[PDB]
Write a protein that binds this ligand. Sequence first.
Ligand SMILES: Nc1ncnc2c1ncn2[C@@H]1O[C@H](COP(=O)(O)OP(=O)(O)O)[C@@H](O)[C@H]1O
Ligand SMILES: Nc1ncnc2c1ncn2[C@@H]1O[C@H](COP(=O)(O)OP(=O)(O)O)[C@@H](O)[C@H]1O
Ligand SMILES: [Mg+2]
Ligand SMILES: [Mg+2]
Lengths: 442, 444, 585
Amino acid sequence: KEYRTIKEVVGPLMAVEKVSGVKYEELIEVRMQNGEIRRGQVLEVQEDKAMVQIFEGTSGINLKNSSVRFLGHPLQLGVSEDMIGRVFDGLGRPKDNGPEILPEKYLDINGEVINPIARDYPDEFIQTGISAIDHLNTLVRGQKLPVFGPPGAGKSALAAQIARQATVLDSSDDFAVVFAAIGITFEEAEFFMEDFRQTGAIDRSVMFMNLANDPAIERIATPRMALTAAEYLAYEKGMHVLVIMEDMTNYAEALREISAARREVPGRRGYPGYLYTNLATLFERAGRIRGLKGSVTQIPILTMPEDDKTHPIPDLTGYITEGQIILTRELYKSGIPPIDVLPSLSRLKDKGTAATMNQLFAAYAQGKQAKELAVVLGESALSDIDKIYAKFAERFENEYVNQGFYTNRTITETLDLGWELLAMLPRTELKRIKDDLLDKYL
Amino acid sequence: KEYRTIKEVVGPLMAVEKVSGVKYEELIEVRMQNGEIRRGQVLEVQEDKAMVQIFEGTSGINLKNSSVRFLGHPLQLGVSEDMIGRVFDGLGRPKDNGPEILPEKYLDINGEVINPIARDYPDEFIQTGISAIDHLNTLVRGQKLPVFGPPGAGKSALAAQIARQATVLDSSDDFAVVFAAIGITFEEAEFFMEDFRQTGAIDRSVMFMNLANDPAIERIATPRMALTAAEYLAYEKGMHVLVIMEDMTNYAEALREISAARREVPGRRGYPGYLYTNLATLFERAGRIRGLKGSVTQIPILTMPEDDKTHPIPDLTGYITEGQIILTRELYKSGISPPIDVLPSLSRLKDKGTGAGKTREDHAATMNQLFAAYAQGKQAKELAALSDIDKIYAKFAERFENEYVNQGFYTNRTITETLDLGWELLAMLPRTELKRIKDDLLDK
Amino acid sequence: QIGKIIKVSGPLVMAENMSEASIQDMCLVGDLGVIGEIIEMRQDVASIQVYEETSGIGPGEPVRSTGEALSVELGPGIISQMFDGIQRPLDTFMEVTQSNFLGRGVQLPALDHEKQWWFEATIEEGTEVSAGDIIGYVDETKIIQHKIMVPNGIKGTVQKIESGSFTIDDPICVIETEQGLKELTMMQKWPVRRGRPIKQKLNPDVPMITGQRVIDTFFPVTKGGAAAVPGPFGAGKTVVQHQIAKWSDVDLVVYVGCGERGNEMTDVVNEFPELIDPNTGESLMERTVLIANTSNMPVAAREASIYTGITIAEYFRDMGYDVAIMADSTSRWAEALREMSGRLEEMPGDEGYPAYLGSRLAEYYERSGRVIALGSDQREGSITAISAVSPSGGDISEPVTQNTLRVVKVFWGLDSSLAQKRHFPSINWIQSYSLYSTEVGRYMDQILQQDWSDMVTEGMRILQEEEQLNEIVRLVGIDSLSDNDRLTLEVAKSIREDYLQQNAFDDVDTFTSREKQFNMLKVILTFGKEARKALSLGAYFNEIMEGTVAVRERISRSKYIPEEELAKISSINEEIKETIQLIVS
Ligand SMILES: Nc1ncnc2c1ncn2[C@@H]1O[C@H](COP(=O)(O)OP(=O)(O)O)[C@@H](O)[C@H]1O
Ligand SMILES: Nc1ncnc2c1ncn2[C@@H]1O[C@H](COP(=O)(O)OP(=O)(O)O)[C@@H](O)[C@H]1O
Ligand SMILES: [Mg+2]
Ligand SMILES: [Mg+2]
């Protein structure tokens, strides 16, 4: 019907009077006096009054001559099989200037809660194509495995390399990747877009771009939009979806900005008190469903604020996520993806697939333990004989973990290569026995 | 006289409209629609509007069919000589399932502040039964001596030990104890009640029990009720009353909860600004009165936090109380029972407490010297290696702590045995370095 | 009476024309009919906190009150069921809504009202009964006997009662009360906010056999006591609660998950119905009531979870059984309270949490405990409360942990540094504590007739002296201090790796019976003790234990010895003796 009764405008908030039939989180469009159209969302409604927040901004709005249309539905996304191979913005509008796809149906981006009985335990394996992940911190279809990275470290390129080299080693080939950029620079956005179009991975991926200069409301809506598309492709058609998100820290900063603009009661460190629940709303959307073929896997990538007190975002993310991946600038300087595998740990690797793993872990850790003290630890008698393990560990960093961002080491590649390194140490020496596993020494 | 006009109910608060003659801190009864009766208290009154808070809660209240009666008096307590040997809750309701005692009169639990000229200086001695108290930090009839400790240290047992072994060397008047539990678990509740009924001390004590699951309003009213009963039994019946409160930190926490429910302006550390005065109005209820036989002695017992700067509860309590008793969980681990660290513990009224006639002629000489003796002894072995000029003092410190391990909480060391052990263990290497006026006090 | 919404703002919805409703009443809000709880009421207008999501709800939509407080249905059909915070069956929800997701605005009865159960009367017609007496029983499972007892507040004389096949809605007994004639069903409704009344509370002095060595030996928990388990990131608190859920001498187990991982909850739903009773009875799920709430669930439903669970625990405790309730996690519950108190503009106490947090936690933990159930039967029941705490970064100074420890007596604090190793128990022996050690020592000493209290005190003293030795070890070495203290370090290592270290998801190490505990502790302690007697009696400075390397492996195997072969560890101890006495000469 379209009311033309704007009563109050305070910053990004606007109050429309003499309304009827307005609902919570309802979308609105502002027809300005100059013809510009701006989207917004209902934050509160009371009788003939309705408070809303405009996404783009509030500059240049004339309260007398402008009008507000009430759409009558919350944040929605139009889903369709033609969604593969396209790039969208945070709200879902096309960005690649391609053909306008006809949506099969519109779904609320908030999704619905999964019944604990209907949820299935993740038991399959994703070949990420990267050595450390595939043989040390294995990813499981349905597991939320985060990636920690120093500012400007290998976390920004690890996203692209995983998003391209991910594939399924199984008869079912319903694979699909959903990449979501959250508050990044245009150079990083073009990094991802150009790499996707160059390697051809964009043909099998759905990208949701949200620049850092974009509004904080769109930054909040971006990951939920990506997960909505992922759930459609996975639980309605039969597709194993791998969601990658970067960056998460910016999502939380924008959420702080949101609650600061809404004058809500702030919790600790200026963040909203419901930040934990709002992150849960996004992390629990992954997994499998009993009776359905598809699955939703999530890889959130965040910049760690560590070496300081644990911020609520790495704390709560690493608590709700089953495992974590740690990267270090000490390895990034040595030309290593620079995945530090000593603190990295996956808590679902048991179902994802151990003999070679439990052996390699203590092996490279023994090379680090021989370097635990000052220089090479550390007793004159140990000398070269102890240096055997550390020679192996130097090679472990130089050729096993350091493979490159364009090298797709499949499960075969990584598994077979891993056995080659152990050739540095003697052959029947896995802790701990005389001949605990003679077979397949290599 | 019943008002059936409830206007709004927001959480634990309720507004009653169209009232007249309502006063501040007036308690009220709510007749619910189902017949359930709930008590509450007036927190604010604006014209015919009156804001009150319900004690039990606000669950299942329909505003239309409920009514409110205004009793016309603040929080009261019915006092009587039959109060000895009974157990009450925070508000005064019986918990021992005994006969309803007929009250002599009802008194406001807030009491009245004592005129400074009418207060009397404490001069008598209480035999607490602990040597570490009766000889080093002497308790005086009317002195507020607190007990500080870490969470879960030697305080719950020390409370019972003092509450049983406390007595005076007289029969006129007969000694009385008022034990108040504030915000404790049922197991600690039964610990105190069972120990009292086992040792027979309940026959000469009055217990005011307030569990941790009890409402915060009752938790606030508990210590004030206990002190009201103590003042009655002391200043009106001439009984020397010993009040023991535990725990006071829970009282402070529940008071924070109260002010958070009343939407009051929070002061420092989230606590109300009037906390200092509200604690003073409870600590200054002790002492003696000129012209009255009885006396009120107070022993508040509190948990001290660690590494949290200095909490206003321990600071203000130790400043308004004449002295303090410090104990440590390191001592509880070493087997000390009761684990009383006498180096930081100090009693400000021990000078008047002891003397010739009061305890003994030699007690004043032994106290001042035991201070320096244990100081030098402990600082001899661990200042703030091998040597001998102070090793002889080191062994003294070690045996001073070890002989208090084998005594336990069930040792009733009288003043005679306390002074006897004092001089009996003072003399191993007699030296003139000890500052005694003459050698007749060096007979031990 | 029907209401009308006037304001919607997040979880808070105000609705006018609600004069006939009351406070804390559950209502259906909006056209969708979402569940909400009335918190405030200004004249006719009532402020309701909606449990489910409120997106798509506005003014003018009607609101209808149920007329009762938070409902829990207590009757046959409650075991082997998975509920939400509001006691709604998830399997029936999936089968009725025909959707794998939980739709907004769907309300279903908790128990199967149409299912037939065999009722057996155990009382004669004409016997006067009060509130709490047992009139019949139903064999809900082969292990648990669901006793149909009188609802609370009903006192009268039995008119007629007879055994037969009936539903939970069919009347099975008539009672002549003072108000008149009243029919009693097999299911009673109770509010979860108010605890079930009892006759008299008593001290919990009966220790529980949890099957965990480190738990049942040094920091034990009694039937009715309270235990808090605060752990860093992933130290193992949830798996500790799992272990207590599977191996425990309790009759029933109520597992409430509030705000935890959905996958971690599905793990429970998967592994519970495939584990059998320790004594080879029935399935674990046939003796456990699960109350699941994902981290992503409605914040209010997460707030009501522990209350529903403790109410079910009280219902089965009123029958005379031993119930163990496991909460995971009370920190998420407290954070839900923080969210509600922050959106209600209430005065913050510490770190944004409401100031009445301590009071609410006291109200919860005081409901659990060994009590005498109401009724002339004078039966005794207990509720052992085990709760898991999730402190930010593992800071124990967090108000949740502090307020929980202010009312509980058992503290199993987990350590990050100990979680890094294989010691996933991670219960720091120096930091953790148990005030039941005295009472449990007395009981475990008397029923076994062994010097168990002395054994426990000696082992704990060895671990404390090891905490001091851990400082004295740096920069000076093993050869520096006396060989006596070197042996002390080896004995502490023996306890840490053979007795304290216990894998939970193991074939035989997951359960350690009481006899096995005493025997394993005997092997370790007598090893240390024989070495203690020998060392100061002419032990070489480099020859101390070289001849015992073949017998210490037996100690390491003691944790893998099956419980069916009980008398193996006794053969271990004597060989220890014979070896160590002759190696010296
Ligand atoms: N080591 C400890 N750390 C933290 N809390 C404890 C400890 N020991 C006991 N508590 C808890 O502190 C609460 C209050 O104990 P408190 O009255 O201080 O005991 P005590 O008087 O023996 O010191 C009790 O409910 C108990 O559960
Ligand atoms: N007793 C135990 N033995 C071996 N591993 C354990 C034990 N307890 C926990 N774990 C390990 O801890 C992980 C789960 O931790 P969890 O119980 O969820 O604690 P949190 O709630 O702190 O994450 C699992 O990977 C499991 O292998
Ligand atoms: Mg106590
Ligand atoms: Mg957990």
